[PDB]
Design a protein around this motif. Sequence first.
Motif, PDB file in Angstrom:
ATOM      1  N   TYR A 116     -27.674   3.136 -50.089  1.00 25.47           N
ATOM      2  CA  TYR A 116     -29.088   2.849 -50.181  1.00 25.47           C
ATOM      3  C   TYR A 116     -29.843   4.032 -50.843  1.00 25.47           C
ATOM      4  N   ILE A 148     -36.165   0.073 -48.336  1.00 26.40           N
ATOM      5  CA  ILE A 148     -36.609  -1.308 -48.563  1.00 26.40           C
ATOM      6  C   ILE A 148     -35.314  -2.132 -48.567  1.00 26.40           C
ATOM      7  N   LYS A 197     -23.407  -7.792 -43.407  1.00 22.04           N
ATOM      8  CA  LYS A 197     -23.196  -6.912 -42.250  1.00 22.04           C
ATOM      9  C   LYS A 197     -24.289  -5.892 -41.960  1.00 22.04           C
TER      10      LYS A 197
END
Length: 270
Positions: free
Chosen positions: A63, A79, A95
Amino acid sequence: PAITLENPDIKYPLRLIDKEVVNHDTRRFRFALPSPEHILGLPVGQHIYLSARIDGNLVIRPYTPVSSDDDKGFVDLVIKVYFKDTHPKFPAGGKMSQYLESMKIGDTIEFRGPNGLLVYQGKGKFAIRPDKKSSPVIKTVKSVGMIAGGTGITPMLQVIRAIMKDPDDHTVCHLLFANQTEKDILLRPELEELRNEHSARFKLWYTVDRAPEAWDYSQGFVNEEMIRDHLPPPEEEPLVLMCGPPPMIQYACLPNLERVGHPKERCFAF
Ligand SMILES: Cc1cc2nc3c(=O)[nH]c(=O)nc-3n(C[C@H](O)[C@H](O)[C@H](O)COP(=O)(O)OP(=O)(O)OC[C@@H]3O[C@@H](n4cnc5c(N)ncnc54)[C@H](O)[C@@H]3O)c2cc1C
């Protein structure tokens, strides 16, 4: 100020302090840094990994936060597009997305970082490592092509923001953002239309599969024409980031980028 990510091999549990339902189908997660005067410590071009034990197995995913090293004490806002189970798409959902959605304020989650082979140094110099050891694309100084699909926008926004933030950075950013419908256009407001404030250096174009009634942009995918009218031409020796929409990095780089003549050495997939 103190860095959170002091060692890339160490894992850092961060507490969840806030959760906004934006709703592109999205959420915004705000996590606390060790303290109010800490910054995350994530060089531009790089990402983080979140890792958790989900349904008894270790899961790990990358991320690119939306907050910056300018933020302080939370310098981490992520986000997230959530892939719900029991929807159109395949049974169990995703997941990590679903787990984050399950967290409760005060729950912590493990952050590891920085990760990535590309680092933006400012004023157009890109430090890229191939196999091992970085080489500056010192010169670019001037121009970058970005192709993002769905959640691939985040790594792109990070770099766009870094450039525009520098009044003396003359690098021109051209973004081609692909999505299935006008509906998954993640971060559209969330100042993508920051084109309004910097179009001399920021060129935005959208493409979607399913176009709405009075669509002003493009539809369908890549062709090669799309690449032609919306990204800097080979002749300019630009750098190309996320070749086709980030989705499952297939095709090798883009067959469309080769076609117009962009060297494969100048095409980077995050
Ligand atoms: C550099 C980088 C930065 C990223 N930054 C972000 C970011 O900031 N925000 C972000 O949200 N993601 C980001 N991603 C995407 C990354 O996959 C995430 O960890 C994302 O959360 C996907 O994981 P998951 O475990 O929830 O899904 P998995 O369990 O991996 O499921 C994979 C899924 O298969 C399909 N799928 C499963 N369920 C569905 C469903 N209901 N509908 C449609 N397709 C479905 C989708 O293709 C989806 O990817 C990034 C990826 C990279 C490489």
